[PDB]
Enzyme design. Structure first.
Site, PDB file in Angstrom:
ATOM      1  N   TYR A   1       6.879   2.853 -13.186  1.00 24.59           N
ATOM      2  CA  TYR A   1       6.182   2.577 -11.927  1.00 24.59           C
ATOM      3  C   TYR A   1       6.010   1.073 -11.682  1.00 24.59           C
ATOM      4  O   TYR A   1       6.266   0.576 -10.577  1.00 24.59           O
ATOM      5  CB  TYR A   1       4.825   3.279 -11.958  1.00 24.59           C
ATOM      6  CG  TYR A   1       3.889   2.972 -10.819  1.00 24.59           C
ATOM      7  CD1 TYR A   1       4.134   3.445  -9.536  1.00 24.59           C
ATOM      8  CD2 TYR A   1       2.750   2.208 -11.032  1.00 24.59           C
ATOM      9  CE1 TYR A   1       3.256   3.166  -8.496  1.00 24.59           C
ATOM     10  CE2 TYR A   1       1.879   1.927 -10.011  1.00 24.59           C
ATOM     11  CZ  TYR A   1       2.131   2.405  -8.746  1.00 24.59           C
ATOM     12  OH  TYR A   1       1.250   2.113  -7.737  1.00 24.59           O
TER      13      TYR A   1
ATOM     14  N   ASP B 217       0.839  -1.188   0.000  1.00 25.41           N
ATOM     15  CA  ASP B 217       0.000   0.000   0.000  1.00 25.41           C
ATOM     16  C   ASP B 217       0.881   1.246   0.000  1.00 25.41           C
ATOM     17  O   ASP B 217       2.103   1.153   0.221  1.00 25.41           O
ATOM     18  CB  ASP B 217      -0.937  -0.029   1.216  1.00 25.41           C
ATOM     19  CG  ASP B 217      -2.220   0.764   1.000  1.00 25.41           C
ATOM     20  OD1 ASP B 217      -2.268   1.588   0.064  1.00 25.41           O
ATOM     21  OD2 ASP B 217      -3.189   0.562   1.775  1.00 25.41           O
TER      22      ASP B 217
ATOM     23  N   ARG C  74       2.669   7.163  -3.311  1.00 19.57           N
ATOM     24  CA  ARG C  74       3.415   8.081  -2.464  1.00 19.57           C
ATOM     25  C   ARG C  74       4.887   7.665  -2.414  1.00 19.57           C
ATOM     26  O   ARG C  74       5.790   8.488  -2.630  1.00 19.57           O
ATOM     27  CB  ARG C  74       2.801   8.117  -1.064  1.00 19.57           C
ATOM     28  CG  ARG C  74       3.371   9.170  -0.171  1.00 19.57           C
ATOM     29  CD  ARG C  74       2.709   9.144   1.201  1.00 19.57           C
ATOM     30  NE  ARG C  74       1.249   9.150   1.129  1.00 19.57           N
ATOM     31  CZ  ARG C  74       0.459   8.973   2.187  1.00 19.57           C
ATOM     32  NH1 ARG C  74       0.998   8.784   3.385  1.00 19.57           N
ATOM     33  NH2 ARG C  74      -0.863   8.992   2.057  1.00 19.57           N
TER      34      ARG C  74
ATOM     35  N   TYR D 156      -8.656   3.050 -15.791  1.00 22.98           N
ATOM     36  CA  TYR D 156      -8.953   1.920 -16.664  1.00 22.98           C
ATOM     37  C   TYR D 156      -8.401   0.601 -16.155  1.00 22.98           C
ATOM     38  O   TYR D 156      -7.239   0.536 -15.746  1.00 22.98           O
ATOM     39  CB  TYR D 156      -8.388   2.221 -18.041  1.00 22.98           C
ATOM     40  CG  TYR D 156      -8.773   3.598 -18.528  1.00 22.98           C
ATOM     41  CD1 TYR D 156     -10.072   3.872 -18.927  1.00 22.98           C
ATOM     42  CD2 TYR D 156      -7.833   4.619 -18.594  1.00 22.98           C
ATOM     43  CE1 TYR D 156     -10.425   5.120 -19.376  1.00 22.98           C
ATOM     44  CE2 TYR D 156      -8.174   5.861 -19.045  1.00 22.98           C
ATOM     45  CZ  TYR D 156      -9.471   6.106 -19.438  1.00 22.98           C
ATOM     46  OH  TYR D 156      -9.834   7.341 -19.891  1.00 22.98           O
TER      47      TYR D 156
END
Ligand SMILES: [Hg+2]
Ligand SMILES: [Hg+2]
Ligand SMILES: [Hg+2]
Ligand SMILES: [Hg+2]
Ligand SMILES: [Hg+2]
Ligand SMILES: [Hg+2]
Ligand SMILES: [Hg+2]
Ligand SMILES: [Hg+2]
Ligand SMILES: [Hg+2]
Ligand SMILES: [Hg+2]
Ligand SMILES: [Hg+2]
Ligand SMILES: [Hg+2]
Lengths: 285, 285
Positions: free
Chosen positions: A48, A31, A35, A80
């Site tokens: 990413y 999680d 950030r 999406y």
């Protein structure tokens, strides 16, 4: 044993203790990754998906080396869906993580309503196919169990249909064990801990939640997790949650009871989970 | 729209307006730490525990309903002699003060869990079960609030299995999620909006209703120390802080904001909420 001695232990010793005393099953969704990615990597030049995958592998390796048998990691849950498809496919197609599964003798399973919820496309069908092939391919691995949740948030209807089919086939209702096997692919009794992040919340390990499931919520995004942090959590779970004996309140001195008493009367509004929002971000207080 | 102090300061009617508007519709609140509470606040041989406890239970349920929460789910008994728990159970359906409470506050009372099978097969146990059934019929004309007492309501898998098999046999097809929830609880609710726990970070006994949107809290003091202020800090956090918008735009943040966040996350030890400490045989978050 004290905390410092636990932290100071060799990895092998820790792992022996964890195989002995648990947790056998840790639920750990990764999680706060957005950030994390904006703080630690370079958002417009770095990818990413790959950065995230590397961190995921570092932490799953850390969990399995510390002796945890089963890790349950919710991956996608109720912009999406096709975007999520790529990241998912990585779990069955990335060479480093395949190498990881084989090296650490990890059996990989997928749970949830993904076959129906994923898009009916060549792509979605391809990911689903990857999942089946990966669960088959790693099924000879016996040292660890890795369970990826993909739409694994609510099993009510799944369990209904499974139970109906089961009754028609075997002549009788399935047991809890059989229900859990039908949903996850294999059996485990319960989750021993859930390691969450940020806002105090848990999700996506249906059928397995118990009052014995130890709950934790990191402040920092999951990917900042170190060995030392993991060990403080493990130490609390193993030595502090089931501490014995239970308090004999009647054996306590009047000063002890008075300290407790006046503390609860003075700040009966101390609530963990009540947070504060600054610069758009929630912080637990 | 509001700060914490302003929320704390609102008249009860306005707080209830806000709660009916933004939720929570459903709060799970087991009354926990009652032994500690009783030993700190009362005189064990001279005060009656059943009624001290009952009095507090009524105070809290009343407080919750007056703040506008439609449904309260309160686990009562959960997986020493089971016969001991029987008396406390019977009070919920027979005590004249609490029945008066159901009447004055227009509460519909329901019981969930494996109690009919798990309770002892005795005149006493059956009497308790029948009183549960009759209480539910007797208050079924109340429409303002829903109160759900959990008695062995920790694991619903086999209950749902059997229910679904029977449903398919009679009501023609597999039951929907809604129909499963109704079958287990007696009526329908979409999910639990919050869980208010105590001490060691743990949740339990609200099968089918847990969601990643379920806000989690853990009081430090035993439940019966709850005041209006405690409840409202909880409500303020849930309503205004958990879903804060907009989402943080990290790319719009100054180097100092990122730096602070980053050094906080990099710093060791890192705060893990749920890792506690045991002093005098007691766990503290
Ligand atoms: Hg960005
Ligand atoms: Hg291992
Ligand atoms: Hg396996
Ligand atoms: Hg498998
Ligand atoms: Hg699993
Ligand atoms: Hg079967
Ligand atoms: Hg801050
Ligand atoms: Hg006592
Ligand atoms: Hg009300
Ligand atoms: Hg009702
Ligand atoms: Hg309910
Ligand atoms: Hg203390």
């Amino acid at each position: 044993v004290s905390e410092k001695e636990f932290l100071d232990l060799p990895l092998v010793s820790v792992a022996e203790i964890v195989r002995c005393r648990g947790p056998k099953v840790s639920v750990f969704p990764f999680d706060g990754t957005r950030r994390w990615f904006h703080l630690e990597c370079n958002p417009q030049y770095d990818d990413y998906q790959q950065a995230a995958l590397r961190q995921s592998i570092r932490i799953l390796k850390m969990l399995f080396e510390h002796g945890i048998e089963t890790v349950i990691s919710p991956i996608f849950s109720d912009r999406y869906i096709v975007q999520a498809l790529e990241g998912m496919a990585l779990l069955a197609n990335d060479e480093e993580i395949l190498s990881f599964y084989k090296e650490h003798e990890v059996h990989v399973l997928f749970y949830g309503d993904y076959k129906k919820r994923l898009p009916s496309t060549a792509q979605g069908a391809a990911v689903v196919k990857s999942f089946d092939d990966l669960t088959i391919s790693t099924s000879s691995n016996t040292e660890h169990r890795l369970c990826f949740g993909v739409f694994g948030n609510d099993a009510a209807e799944s369990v209904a249909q499974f139970s109906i089919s089961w009754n028609e086939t075997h002549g009788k209702p399935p047991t809890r064990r059989e229900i859990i096997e039908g949903y996850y692919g294999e059996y485990v009794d319960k989750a021993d801990m859930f390691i969450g992040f940020g806002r105090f919340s848990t999700f996506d390990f249906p059928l397995l939640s118990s009052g014995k499931t130890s709950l934790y919520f990191t402040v920092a995004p999951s990917y900042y997790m170190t060995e030392t942090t993991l060990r403080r959590i493990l130490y609390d779970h193993i030595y502090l949650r089931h501490f014995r004996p239970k308090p004999d309140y009647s054996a306590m001195s009047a000063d002890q009871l008075n300290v407790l008493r006046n503390r609860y009367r003075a700040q009966p509004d101390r609530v963990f989970g009540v947070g504060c929002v600054h610069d758009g971000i929630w912080f637990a207080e």
